[PDB]
UniProtKB/Swiss-Prot annotation, chain A:
Posttranslational modification: N-glycosylated.
Range within the parent protein: 305 to 349 of 911
Lineage of origin: Eukaryota, Metazoa, Chordata, Craniata, Vertebrata
Protein name from the UniProt record: Band 3 anion transport protein
Protein family (similarity comment): Belongs to the anion exchanger (TC 2.A.31) family.
Origin superkingdom: Eukaryota
Curated annotation (Swiss-Prot), chain B:
Extent of the ANK repeats: 16-45, 49-78, 82-109
Subunit relationships: Component of the ankyrin-1 complex in the erythrocyte, composed of ANK1, RHCE, RHAG, SLC4A1, EPB42, GYPA, GYPB and AQP1. Interacts with a number of integral membrane proteins and cytoskeletal proteins. Interacts (via N-terminus) with SPTB/spectrin (beta chain). Also interacts with TTN/titin. Isoform Mu17 interacts with OBSCN isoform 3/obscurin. Interacts with HIF1AN. Interacts (via ANK 1-5 repeats) with RHCE; this interaction mediates the primary membrane attachment site for ANK1. Interacts (via ANK 1-2 repeats) with AQP1 (via the N-terminal). Interacts (via ANK 1-13 repeats) with EPB42.
Gene: ANK1
Post-translational modification: Regulated by phosphorylation.
Domain notes: The 55 kDa regulatory domain is involved in regulating binding of SPTB/spectrin (beta chain) and SLC4A1/erythrocyte membrane protein band 3. The ANK repeat region forms a spiral around a large central cavity and is involved in binding of ion transporters. Adopts a T-shaped arrangement, in the ankyrin-1 complex, in which ANK 1-5 repeats are orthogonal to ANK 6-24 repeats, with the peptide binding groove of ANK 1-5 repeats oriented toward the membrane. The rearrangement of the ANK 1-5 repeats orients the canonical protein binding groove to directly face the membrane, to interact the membrane-embedded targets RHCE and AQP1.
Shown residues within the full chain: 685 to 814 of 1881
Source species: Homo sapiens (Human)
Protein name: Ankyrin-1
């Protein structure tokens, strides 16, 4: 159960990036706060 | 396990306010940190100088105790009477791994805490 | 002592060539960053592990 809970927390802070027709390399830099907050959410309770 | 089943107080404090969770975090014994936290230890307990079990782990460089204490409710922003936060201490002694973990959870803003020891020997 | 750092190795059940016999051979290794073994026999560039 502890392993399953850790994996649920792992998936809760995983960032799914869906397909898009235009990879701009700049709209990808708009998800820097998202990744930062998802890490704070894994490192925190 | 034997002591806790007997009825020993989990959050006993020394003269300067150190709990067994403070000492286990200080000395890098993560299995007992988990054991103490499973038995209702105060993760945010403070000594007389305001040091958390998370300031001891950050001061001694134990990155995995830092992670386990944060995940069990430790505060990365509570400050001590000396004016240090669990991260400033990590930056002061240059623990890159502890700074990297405590940097994510700590928001934007020369004394070392040592638990008492027994020097008795025969 | 209670927790150590972890080096991860990925091994797959593959069949070779000269013998057509099944063997466990390494495909990837994780030391902080992940490395994958190519067909030529060289470990590739370290990379973030996308899933």
């Amino acid at each position: 159960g502890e392993l399953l809970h850790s994996l649920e927390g792992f998936l809760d802070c995983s960032l799914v990036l869906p397909p898009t027709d235009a990879p701009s390399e700049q709209a990808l830099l708009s998800l820097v706060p998202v990744q930062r907050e998802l890490l704070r959410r894994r490192y925190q309770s | 396990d034997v002591l806790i089943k007997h009825g020993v107080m989990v959050d006993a404090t020394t003269r300067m306010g150190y709990t067994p969770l403070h000492v286990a975090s200080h000395y890098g014994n993560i299995k007992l940190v988990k054991f103490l936290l499973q038995h209702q230890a105060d993760v945010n307990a403070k000594t007389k100088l305001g040091y958390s079990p998370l300031h001891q782990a950050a001061q001694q460089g134990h990155t995995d105790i830092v992670t386990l204490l944060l995940k069990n409710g430790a505060s990365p922003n509570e400050v001590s009477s000396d004016g240090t936060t669990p991260l400033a201490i990590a930056k002061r002694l240059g623990y890159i791994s502890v700074t990297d973990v405590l940097k994510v959870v700590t928001d934007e803003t020369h004394r070392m805490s040592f638990p008492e020891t027994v020097d008795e020997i025969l | 002592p209670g927790t150590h750092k972890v080096y991860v190795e990925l091994q797959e059940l593959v069949m070779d060539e000269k013998n057509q016999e099944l063997r466990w051979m390494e495909a990837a290794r994780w030391v902080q960053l992940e490395e994958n073994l190519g067909e030529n026999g060289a470990w590739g560039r370290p990379h973030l592990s996308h899933l």
